[PDB]
Amino acid sequence: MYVKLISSDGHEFIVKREHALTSGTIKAMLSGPETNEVNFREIPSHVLSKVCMYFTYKVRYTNSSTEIPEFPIAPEIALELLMAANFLDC
């Protein structure tokens, strides 16, 4: 029911399938030819973690009747976040 993701530094982050299904590149990597573990050698722990919180925020506030609050983006990590989003096609 859950999938594990390992960052460039080896940190393990486990989230449900539907969290990961948002990202098109993740869908492809899980569609690749038992624990569903995927490593991200180009992404460190904190960036992948905040990508996990972005997934949680999105899946919570998509089709949600309540007002959607702003998601915090740290300026010192904004470039890495955006390039990671381009890599994950999300």
């Binding site: 460039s8 590149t25 890599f87 096609d89």
Partner: protein, 636 residues
């Protein structure tokens, strides 16, 4: 290391990706971590810092795919009589691989191909363009698999389909997969997703299908009668339906069946309608059941046979409605049509799937049958139909159940619609109804009222306007006679008196006698009393008495026994003229009655016929000098 763009060696990473995709196309085991690493490698190659290598990647991928597809073509060409199965297997292998690289090249496709792909409008109105790796793979597969081997593969598919038609079942999986692949290769094309399938396979397949079915028709016609051939046609149709659902793409299904209908059924419409002339006369309960569906498939098959049914029922109903006995014609004429209509209705609904046209075609003939003027009497059909109502609405001794009549009356309505001049029926119905009510011949007003309500529902209030007033007139009239008697109590007639106040409009008694009849004194008191009374509660109204229709009972006391006989008002005065003189001359009767000689002679003739009086003149013909004497010796 992070996602920042950088200078990457194209050769080594390209070789690693080539090894990976080579394992992929053969569906070989690939490490998931290796899969993820190849993703990062692709991303790095796309964002290569010196220049995007995506254009170089696309070319390398296309070249490798071309080499692989050429090798596959060589392998397929090596196989003989096995081309279908092993080419099919390669098709699933290559399609799964193509999907895998489509997922694999997602970033490259989005960033490079999608951003540079020519739009549909530019292609429609305006170097090979950029295509999705899946689209590229499918297009080149069609270019190098389907095109070079197209004749061979179509020929083999047609051979296998014909073998299945011959009962030799080939492998459904392989050829069905190839058929679906034909759609699959161009499934990425937004416009005309079935164009290539129709162009290369569907049209030749349909051509062969029609030729095979035309030959099959010929063989079965030469070997079977109409019934056997048509049963074989139905079997072949259902078999081809099963075949198409088993093998072909669904979109072509309705096409192929249509073709199977055209070359095999309609090619001999002259034959289909040749033998239907007797198939319906014989009333083959099951043959027309399957004969109907075949003509529905063809455009013009039904109408010709529809009319032939009308001719059959026209004659069939006529025979059941021509030899009617002149005595009980009305009751049986209504019955005779009923089963003729009733049987065919169940025939049409059950055997012929309840087609609306046939039910319509049924009434086209029954109306021509019921309204037909078979007897020498002109247009006697509605008239004799009216007499049937009397038979079901005349109170007979030990009369059969009114509730069962209600069922008969409902059945009676069915033939009622078939009458053309329904107004003429109403006129005859009224006068016949006029007799029944005036003498109480009907069982009850409630039974008659059912006819009134049904007719109004059948043809509106206006068509039953007179009749409704007819029915209401006497219903209130019962109280009027009773209420008139109260007036005598409120205030001596000497006789038992009853009266009906008829309404001039509805009652069809247009004839008012010119002969000014003289009311007898014994009746002259009562008429004075009622006329004065009528104005009391119903002033402003004129009253006119039709004595000739009034009925009275006279008790003769001169005979040896008291006899009671009912005779008309004109017959009241005649016997009253004998209560003072046992012999009365013609002039005295004429002076007393003051009414015309023509009906007086008819009135006198009736009395002489029943031997009420004795004619004192030797001539059998009554003249103006004819004297008459009472019959003191009459007995009954």
């Amino acid at each position: 290391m992070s996602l920042k763009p950088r200078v990457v060696d194209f050769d080594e990473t390209w070789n690693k990706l080539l090894t990976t995709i080579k394992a992929v196309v053969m569906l070989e085991y690939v490490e998931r971590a290796t899969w993820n690493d190849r993703f990062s490698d692709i991303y790095a190659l796309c964002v290569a810092y010196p220049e995007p290598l995506g254009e170089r990647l696309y070319t390398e991928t296309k070249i490798f795919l071309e080499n692989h597809v050429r090798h596959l073509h060589k392998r397929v060409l090596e196989s003989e009589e096995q081309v279908l199965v092993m080419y099919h297997r390669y098709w699933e292998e290559y399609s799964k691989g193509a999907d895998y690289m489509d997922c694999l090249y997602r970033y490259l496709n989005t960033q490079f191909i999608k951003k540079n792909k020519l739009t549909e409008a530019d292609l429609q109105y305006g170097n090979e363009p950029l295509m999705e790796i899946g689209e590229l793979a499918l297009d080149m597969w069609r270019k190098l698999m389907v095109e070079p081997l197209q004749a061979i593969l179509i020929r083999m598919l047609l051979r296998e389909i014909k073998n299945d038609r011959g009962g030799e079942d080939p492998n459904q999986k392989v050829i069905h997969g190839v058929i679906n692949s034909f759609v699959h290769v161009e499934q990425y094309k937004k416009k005309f997703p079935l164009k290539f399938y129709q162009e290369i396979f569907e049209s030749p397949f349909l051509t062969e299908t029609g030729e095979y079915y035309k030959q099959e028709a010929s063989n079965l016609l030469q070997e079977s009668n109409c019934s056997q051939y048509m049963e074989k046609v139905l079997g072949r149709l259902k078999d081809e339906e099963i075949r198409c659902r088993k093998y072909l793409h669904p979109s072509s299904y309705t096409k192929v069946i249509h073709e199977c209908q055209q070359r095999m059924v309609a090619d001999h419409l002259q034959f289909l309608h040749a033998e239907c002339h007797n198939i319906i006369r014989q009333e083959k309960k099951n043959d027309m059941a399957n004969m109907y569906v075949l003509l529905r498939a063809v455009s013009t098959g039904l109408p010709h046979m529809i009319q032939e049914l009308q001719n059959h029922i026209h004659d069939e109903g006529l025979r059941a409605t021509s030899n009617l006995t002149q005595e009980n014609m009305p009751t049986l004429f209504v019955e005779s049509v009923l089963e003729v209509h009733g049987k065919f209705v169940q025939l049409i609904n059950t055997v012929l799937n309840g087609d609306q046209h046939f039910m319509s075609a049924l009434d086209k003939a029954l109306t021509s049958v019921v309204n037909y003027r078979e007897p020498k009497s002109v247009c006697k059909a509605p008239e004799l139909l009216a007499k049937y109502c009397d038979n079901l609405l005349k109170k007979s001794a030990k009369g059969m159940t009114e509730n069962e009549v209600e069922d008969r009356l409902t059945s009676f309505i069915t033939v009622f619609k078939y009458i053309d001049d329904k107004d003429v029926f109403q006129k005859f119905y009224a006068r016949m109804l006029a007799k029944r009510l005036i003498h109480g011949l009907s069982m009850s007003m409630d039974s008659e009222e059912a006819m009134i309500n049904k007719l109004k529902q059948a043809c509106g209030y206006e068509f039953t306007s007179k009749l409704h007033r007819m029915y209401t007139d006497m219903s209130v009239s019962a109280d009027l006679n009773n209420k008139f008697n109260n007036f005598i109590k409120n205030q001596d007639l000497g006789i038992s008196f009853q009266i009906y106040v008829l309404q001039a409009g509805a009652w069809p008694l247009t004839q008012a006698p010119s002969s000014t009849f003289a009311i007898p004194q014994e009746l002259e008191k009562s008429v004075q009393m009622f006329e004065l009374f009528y104005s009391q509660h119903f002033s402003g109204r004129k009253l006119t008495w039709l004595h000739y229709l009034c009925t009275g009972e006279v008790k003769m006391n001169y005979l040896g026994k008291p006899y009671v006989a009912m005779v008309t008002t004109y017959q009241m005065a005649v016997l009253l003229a004998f209560n003072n003189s046992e012999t009365v001359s013609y002039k005295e009767l004429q002076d007393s009655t003051q009414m015309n000689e023509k009906e007086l002679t008819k009135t006198i003739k009736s009395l002489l016929d029943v031997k009420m009086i004795n004619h004192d003149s030797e001539k059998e013909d009554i003249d103006a000098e004819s004297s008459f004497s009472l019959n003191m010796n009459f007995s009954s």
